[PDB]
Design an enzyme around this catalytic site. Sequence first.
Site, PDB file in Angstrom:
ATOM      1  N   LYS A   2      -1.755  30.022  19.401  1.00 24.03           N
ATOM      2  CA  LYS A   2      -2.243  28.647  19.805  1.00 24.03           C
ATOM      3  C   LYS A   2      -3.229  28.461  20.296  1.00 24.03           C
ATOM      4  O   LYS A   2      -3.648  29.780  21.245  1.00 24.03           O
ATOM      5  CB  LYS A   2      -1.497  28.072  21.124  1.00 24.03           C
ATOM      6  CG  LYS A   2      -2.077  26.357  21.042  1.00 24.03           C
ATOM      7  CD  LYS A   2      -2.311  25.420  19.815  1.00 24.03           C
ATOM      8  CE  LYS A   2      -2.913  24.270  20.905  1.00 24.03           C
ATOM      9  NZ  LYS A   2      -2.965  23.356  19.269  1.00 24.03           N
ATOM     10  N   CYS A  59     -13.523  23.640  16.877  1.00 27.96           N
ATOM     11  CA  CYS A  59     -13.382  23.332  18.247  1.00 27.96           C
ATOM     12  C   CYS A  59     -15.706  22.293  18.040  1.00 27.96           C
ATOM     13  O   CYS A  59     -15.785  22.339  17.574  1.00 27.96           O
ATOM     14  CB  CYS A  59     -14.424  24.889  18.629  1.00 27.96           C
ATOM     15  SG  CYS A  59     -15.749  25.447  18.491  1.00 27.96           S
TER      16      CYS A  59
HETATM   17  C1  LIG Z   1       0.756  20.299  15.523  1.00 29.47           C
HETATM   18  C2  LIG Z   1       0.205  21.138  15.182  1.00 29.47           C
HETATM   19  C3  LIG Z   1      -1.120  21.504  15.852  1.00 29.47           C
HETATM   20  C4  LIG Z   1      -2.028  22.479  15.614  1.00 29.47           C
HETATM   21  N1  LIG Z   1      -2.828  22.909  16.880  1.00 29.47           N
HETATM   22  C5  LIG Z   1      -3.962  24.264  15.277  1.00 29.47           C
HETATM   23  C6  LIG Z   1      -4.747  24.855  17.064  1.00 29.47           C
HETATM   24  O1  LIG Z   1      -4.214  24.909  18.146  1.00 29.47           O
HETATM   25  N2  LIG Z   1      -6.184  25.460  15.938  1.00 29.47           N
HETATM   26  C7  LIG Z   1      -6.118  25.786  14.820  1.00 29.47           C
HETATM   27  O2  LIG Z   1      -6.810  25.921  13.711  1.00 29.47           O
HETATM   28  N3  LIG Z   1      -5.708  24.297  13.951  1.00 29.47           N
HETATM   29  C8  LIG Z   1      -4.487  23.751  14.413  1.00 29.47           C
HETATM   30  N4  LIG Z   1      -2.994  23.319  13.514  1.00 29.47           N
HETATM   31  C9  LIG Z   1      -4.428  22.593  11.999  1.00 29.47           C
HETATM   32  C10 LIG Z   1      -3.208  23.742  11.153  1.00 29.47           C
HETATM   33  O3  LIG Z   1      -3.200  25.188  11.734  1.00 29.47           O
HETATM   34  C11 LIG Z   1      -3.035  23.421   9.494  1.00 29.47           C
HETATM   35  O4  LIG Z   1      -4.366  23.717   9.832  1.00 29.47           O
HETATM   36  C12 LIG Z   1      -3.203  22.018   9.111  1.00 29.47           C
HETATM   37  O5  LIG Z   1      -2.025  22.049   9.660  1.00 29.47           O
HETATM   38  C13 LIG Z   1      -3.454  22.166   7.627  1.00 29.47           C
HETATM   39  O6  LIG Z   1      -1.782  22.766   7.184  1.00 29.47           O
HETATM   40  P1  LIG Z   1      -0.485  22.165   7.262  1.00 29.47           P
HETATM   41  O7  LIG Z   1      -0.944  21.334   5.597  1.00 29.47           O
HETATM   42  O8  LIG Z   1       0.112  23.252   6.192  1.00 29.47           O
HETATM   43  O9  LIG Z   1       0.250  21.612   8.070  1.00 29.47           O
HETATM   44  C14 LIG Z   1      -2.114  22.925  14.000  1.00 29.47           C
HETATM   45  C15 LIG Z   1      -2.161  21.765  13.462  1.00 29.47           C
HETATM   46  C16 LIG Z   1      -0.553  20.621  13.576  1.00 29.47           C
HETATM   47  C17 LIG Z   1       0.331  20.055  12.601  1.00 29.47           C
HETATM   48  C1  LIG Z   2      -9.078  14.089  19.815  1.00 35.04           C
HETATM   49  O1  LIG Z   2      -9.119  15.620  19.654  1.00 35.04           O
HETATM   50  C2  LIG Z   2      -8.968  16.471  20.336  1.00 35.04           C
HETATM   51  C3  LIG Z   2      -9.418  16.400  22.048  1.00 35.04           C
HETATM   52  C4  LIG Z   2      -9.386  17.357  22.380  1.00 35.04           C
HETATM   53  C5  LIG Z   2      -9.316  18.627  22.006  1.00 35.04           C
HETATM   54  C6  LIG Z   2      -9.443  19.219  20.463  1.00 35.04           C
HETATM   55  C7  LIG Z   2      -9.155  20.272  19.950  1.00 35.04           C
HETATM   56  C8  LIG Z   2      -8.299  20.486  19.094  1.00 35.04           C
HETATM   57  C9  LIG Z   2      -8.820  21.385  18.071  1.00 35.04           C
HETATM   58  C10 LIG Z   2      -7.162  22.205  18.240  1.00 35.04           C
HETATM   59  C11 LIG Z   2      -6.593  21.504  16.437  1.00 35.04           C
HETATM   60  C12 LIG Z   2      -5.510  20.250  17.222  1.00 35.04           C
HETATM   61  C13 LIG Z   2      -5.374  20.033  17.735  1.00 35.04           C
HETATM   62  O2  LIG Z   2      -4.624  20.965  19.944  1.00 35.04           O
HETATM   63  O3  LIG Z   2      -5.519  19.109  18.357  1.00 35.04           O
HETATM   64  N1  LIG Z   2      -4.858  19.892  15.616  1.00 35.04           N
HETATM   65  C14 LIG Z   2      -5.961  20.076  14.346  1.00 35.04           C
HETATM   66  O4  LIG Z   2      -4.629  20.168  13.756  1.00 35.04           O
HETATM   67  N2  LIG Z   2      -6.218  21.262  14.561  1.00 35.04           N
HETATM   68  C15 LIG Z   2      -6.623  21.922  15.435  1.00 35.04           C
HETATM   69  O5  LIG Z   2      -7.985  23.600  14.983  1.00 35.04           O
HETATM   70  C16 LIG Z   2      -8.913  19.104  17.750  1.00 35.04           C
HETATM   71  C17 LIG Z   2      -8.570  18.340  18.718  1.00 35.04           C
HETATM   72  C18 LIG Z   2      -8.820  17.695  19.913  1.00 35.04           C
END
Ligand SMILES: Cc1cc2nc3c(=O)[nH]c(=O)nc-3n(C[C@H](O)[C@H](O)[C@H](O)COP(=O)(O)O)c2cc1C
Ligand SMILES: COc1cccc2cc(CCc3c(C(=O)O)[nH]c(=O)[nH]c3=O)ccc12
Lengths: 313, 313
Positions: free
Chosen positions: B44, B131
């Site tokens: 994560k 970020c």
């Molecule tokens: C619940 C959730 C949490 C995620 N958290 C992150 C994250 O912590 N860091 C990140 O780079 N992308 C995060 N993503 C984005 C996914 O890594 C991915 O880029 C995005 O969901 C698209 O791929 P998919 O179509 O297979 O979902 C998150 C996506 C979901 C649905």
């Molecule tokens: C309103 O969304 C956010 C508030 C504070 C920190 C956040 C940080 C991120 C980066 C982590 C991330 C998230 C997530 O943790 O929300 N979701 C994704 O689909 N991709 C991501 O890369 C995304 C959204 C945030």
Amino acid sequence: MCLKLNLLDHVFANPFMNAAGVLCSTEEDLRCMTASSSGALVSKSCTSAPRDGNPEPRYMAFPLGSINSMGLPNLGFDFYLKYASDLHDYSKKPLFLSISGLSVEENVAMVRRLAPVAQEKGVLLELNLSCPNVPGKPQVAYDFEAMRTYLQQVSLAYGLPFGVKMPPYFDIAHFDTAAAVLNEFPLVKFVTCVNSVGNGLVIDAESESVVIKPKQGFGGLGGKYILPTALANVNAFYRRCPDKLVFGCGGVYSGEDAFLHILAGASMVQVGTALQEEGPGIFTRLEDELLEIMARKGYRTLEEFRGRVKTIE
Amino acid sequence: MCLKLNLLDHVFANPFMNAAGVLCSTEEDLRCMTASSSGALVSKSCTSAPRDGNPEPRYMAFPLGSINSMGLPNLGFDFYLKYASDLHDYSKKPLFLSISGLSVEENVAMVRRLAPVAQEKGVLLELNLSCPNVPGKPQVAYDFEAMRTYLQQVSLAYGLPFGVKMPPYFDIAHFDTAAAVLNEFPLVKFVTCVNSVGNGLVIDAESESVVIKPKQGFGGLGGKYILPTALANVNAFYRRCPDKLVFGCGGVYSGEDAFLHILAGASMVQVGTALQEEGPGIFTRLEDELLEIMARKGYRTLEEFRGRVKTIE
Ligand SMILES: Cc1cc2nc3c(=O)[nH]c(=O)nc-3n(C[C@H](O)[C@H](O)[C@H](O)COP(=O)(O)O)c2cc1C
Ligand SMILES: COc1cccc2cc(CCc3c(C(=O)O)[nH]c(=O)[nH]c3=O)ccc12
Ligand SMILES: Cc1cc2nc3c(=O)[nH]c(=O)nc-3n(C[C@H](O)[C@H](O)[C@H](O)COP(=O)(O)O)c2cc1C
Ligand SMILES: COc1cccc2cc(CCc3c(C(=O)O)[nH]c(=O)[nH]c3=O)ccc12
């Protein structure tokens, strides 16, 4: 119970219309859209000179949507101006004319000409900002300085209420900046959200090939792929531009989809991909479907729910 | 069989892994991904301190995909570092660690600490350029001077090969700019395309309500909605960054979808929404499906078709 709307000093039987570029290029297309049960129609985005557009295949559709790199094929402004001044029957429904000049000067030249027609016949201008400017720069609405320039010059040249067609944005900072630019321009009375989601790439697994010829298969996306993106953009602008109307466009295939647009803030609802695929009979279906949803919920008019999307806590 | 490959000085049993944020937050999650048939796992995205994340509900899925505004809930960098340094079984598969500090300083502080563990254990860094960067400014990847600053500082502080998690772009001039930035940094050895499609809005018609609580229902989109966007970004960066690997992420639900990512140029294929919905059993199915498509086509290796999407004419 009814779908009637009165806005921009026109009356509309229902909120439905084609999305610019679909079923709007030729006199035949425009007569067909007029004959349909849509509440309005918009002409194909035009340029000063006629254009052939990009090489074919340049549009393809699939279960979840479409991709296109049409390249602005159109019969040229003089044709669309004549349709508005001489051929369109305004007793049937209102007409929007979309323009999409390849430079700010090209846009000013067309709107100077359109003004007297807009004034006398009531044709409504949709200015397409989700279009190319200088190659190697981003499209106009992704270059906020260029966008401001275009709106300033068109506002001065046209002098009448108009609206704009916007690409989707994906960042809250861009929603804030884009709406603030638009809010500088009092003549911008409607904002159409959204044009196609830019530069996607569809690949056919059997042939291992992209599906459109221009730009190595990259093109704009429409249809089911873009509904949540469309809703966001409609609602983001509805909230940020309280003195303007918002028209929704993207991912409408049903009365339920139209209902979501309208809950998000939409006043008119445009139909592109689904119209291209189903044909203009779609308008009767969408009217029926939306009225059925309204009956189940006890809503008698669109204003009872427009913009009334609920948020959580 | 078999789908084994070597990348970045590590051996992978197959090209599949989870997408960051999905099934990777707790030691339980990471143990579960390690036990799976995936070729790798990524933790994560983390911050220096632990975070609770945003209010629930913050994730929702539907037939066509998901929407999330998780808000970076994570156990904190010290936990993921300890997992990388003491708990992960590297004889099972490689590990990537995702960092998502809230400023450049926070990233630099985490990477300085991660470097010796990377040298010792071979854990791989994925720097998340979604970020959030100063509030009222665009996410860092959408601010090319901030992005260049981030990579300059991380490269100096970390000094080893790493990769970057990129948001989708939608404009060819932005592909050109973003890829030029990345190509300034020789230590950036892989680019993961794409993160979620930003700030979509899902509305439930029955309840007339958005479906997630944070940010008035606005959140990143994943799943079937985003496959053509993901493919485009994968191919755009593949073409532009010939000395880097591209990892694909977005819309993978099947071996066919993985096949398309790979044709677009993907070296590893990450699975987000579909893994969230199906569970870690998905990895055996994807493997089987991808091998079945290779067999039918006569492909014995991934190398035979990676990046070999055909264009027309
Ligand atoms: C619940 C959730 C949490 C995620 N958290 C992150 C994250 O912590 N860091 C990140 O780079 N992308 C995060 N993503 C984005 C996914 O890594 C991915 O880029 C995005 O969901 C698209 O791929 P998919 O179509 O297979 O979902 C998150 C996506 C979901 C649905
Ligand atoms: C309103 O969304 C956010 C508030 C504070 C920190 C956040 C940080 C991120 C980066 C982590 C991330 C998230 C997530 O943790 O929300 N979701 C994704 O689909 N991709 C991501 O890369 C995304 C959204 C945030
Ligand atoms: C074949 C085709 C041509 C289009 N041409 C135009 C155009 O000339 N001007 C414009 O503003 N948008 C144009 N668009 C974009 C649509 O008006 C619309 O914004 C987009 O397709 C999203 O709506 P949908 O999901 O209903 O397709 C075109 C779309 C398609 C598929
Ligand atoms: C490669 O894309 C283009 C080349 C030349 C002119 C272009 C003009 C436009 C604007 C017209 C337009 C088109 C179009 O005619 O291609 N398609 C859309 O989905 N939305 C639009 O707004 C878009 C792309 C163009």
